[PDB]
Enzyme design. Structure first.
Site, PDB file in Angstrom:
ATOM      1  N   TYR A  81       0.811  -1.193   0.000  1.00 12.75           N
ATOM      2  CA  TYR A  81       0.000   0.000   0.000  1.00 12.75           C
ATOM      3  C   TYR A  81       0.868   1.276   0.000  1.00 12.75           C
ATOM      4  CZ  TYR A  81      -2.926   3.672   1.782  1.00 12.75           C
ATOM      5  OH  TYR A  81      -3.518   4.897   2.015  1.00 12.75           O
ATOM      6  N   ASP A 136       3.274  12.761   9.858  1.00 15.80           N
ATOM      7  CA  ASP A 136       3.442  11.455  10.448  1.00 15.80           C
ATOM      8  C   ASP A 136       2.046  10.905  10.621  1.00 15.80           C
ATOM      9  OD1 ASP A 136       6.350  11.409  10.897  1.00 15.80           O
ATOM     10  OD2 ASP A 136       5.928  13.038  12.280  1.00 15.80           O
ATOM     11  N   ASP A 172      -1.854   4.309  10.060  1.00 12.11           N
ATOM     12  CA  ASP A 172      -2.994   3.718   9.364  1.00 12.11           C
ATOM     13  C   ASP A 172      -3.343   2.412  10.027  1.00 12.11           C
ATOM     14  OD1 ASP A 172      -3.327   5.648   7.399  1.00 12.11           O
ATOM     15  OD2 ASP A 172      -2.960   4.337   5.718  1.00 12.11           O
TER      16      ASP A 172
END
Lengths: 123, 123
Positions: free
Chosen positions: B15, B96, B99
């Site tokens: 990803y 920063d 996820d």
């Protein structure tokens, strides 16, 4: 009150401070009386301070350190990366964990989830 | 199938690879047709590939890099720390982010939440 993004960063940093020193009583007190902890995430939660104090006493020669900044939102939530260092059955090992926490309207951890599995263990 | 802890690490790494290169079509395809994205967490979600492709085209000179290992669980979930680098209105800045993703029984991102706020921006 509901911690702001800056308060969330401070609370979560403090949390790692407490785990590092091993102050079990101060750690348990950061949680709401009815908070739930899922550590590791995927496992069923433990609820309430009694179960949480037992969880921490069992687990806590351990040192934890934030390995990156605390990511905080505007709705009382945050996520942070950290490493825990222990010595498992003579052999010293490390675990990389990511904690996601949600605070209540009192600045207390209401929910906590820890992300890690054996893929993050370096024995 | 439901990615194992090791597959989750690979999917999430991929990803960040895709975001880094800027392959919008390959990114959108990692998601389930009805996936939801909450970026930043706290904000209401966007649902479905159409809304997700629009979100990514809007956002994607950007480079992203994993700043720590992907924490993965046994129930198809994972969390990872990373930094995004852009150049906002002439001035280059960094963000920063953490996820947290949940994969479905097809190895597709079903839900995605991004943790960050202005406290994680370095302009």
């Amino acid at each position: 009150n509901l911690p702001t993004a800056q308060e969330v960063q401070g609370l979560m940093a403090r949390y790692i401070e407490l785990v590092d020193v091993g102050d079990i009583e101060a750690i348990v007190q950061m949680f709401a009386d009815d908070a739930t902890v899922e550590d590791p995430f995927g496992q069923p939660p433990i609820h309430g301070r009694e179960q949480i104090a037992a969880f921490y006493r069992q687990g806590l020669k351990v040192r934890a350190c934030l390995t990156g900044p605390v990511r905080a939102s505007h709705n009382g939530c945050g996520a942070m990366p950290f490493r825990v260092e222990m010595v498992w059955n003579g052999q010293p090992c490390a675990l990389d964990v990511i904690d996601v926490m949600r605070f209540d309207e009192h600045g207390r951890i209401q929910t906590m989830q820890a992300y890690w599995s054996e893929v993050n263990l370096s024995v």
